[PDB]
């Protein structure tokens, strides 16, 4: 049955809730918490990159890939792009906080 095969497919298409919760707190976390999260996002990205390597494909690309290959690569590439977006956010927020720290000391970054 088509509906039941699809529920299994989907109910297992999931993102670690702990990671999602922490990402939601980018704008409230302290720098130390942000840098631990950064590392954990990087570890996740590393895992996705390793699977893309097995698929012999990078992030930008067009032997014949089957439908399932295409679906898997589509999923992995989307995951990567969403994670890279969150990592970028984390870094941008971190830069704001770093700048606040310089401001507090009446110093500028070397630049």
From Swiss-Prot:
**GO biological process terms held by the UniProt record:** proteasome regulatory particle assembly
| Superkingdom to which the source organism belongs | Eukaryota
One Gene Ontology cellular component annotation held by this UniProt entry: cytosol
Keyword annotations of the record: Chaperone
Chaperone found in the keyword field = yes
Subunit-structure text: Part of a transient complex containing NAS2, RPT4 and RPT5 formed during the assembly of the 26S proteasome.
Task: Return the similarity comment.
Answer: Belongs to the proteasome subunit p27 family.
Please tell me what else the database record remarks about this protein.
Answer: Present with 846 molecules/cell in log phase SD medium.
User: What is the documented function of this protein?
Assistant: Acts as a chaperone during the assembly of the 26S proteasome, specifically of the base subcomplex of the 19S regulatory complex (RC). During the base subcomplex assembly is part of a NAS2:RPT4:RPT5 module; NAS2 is released during the further base assembly process.
In Swiss-Prot or TrEMBL terms, this protein is called: Probable 26S proteasome regulatory subunit p27
Q: According to the record, which residues of the full protein are present here? A: 1 to 117 of 220
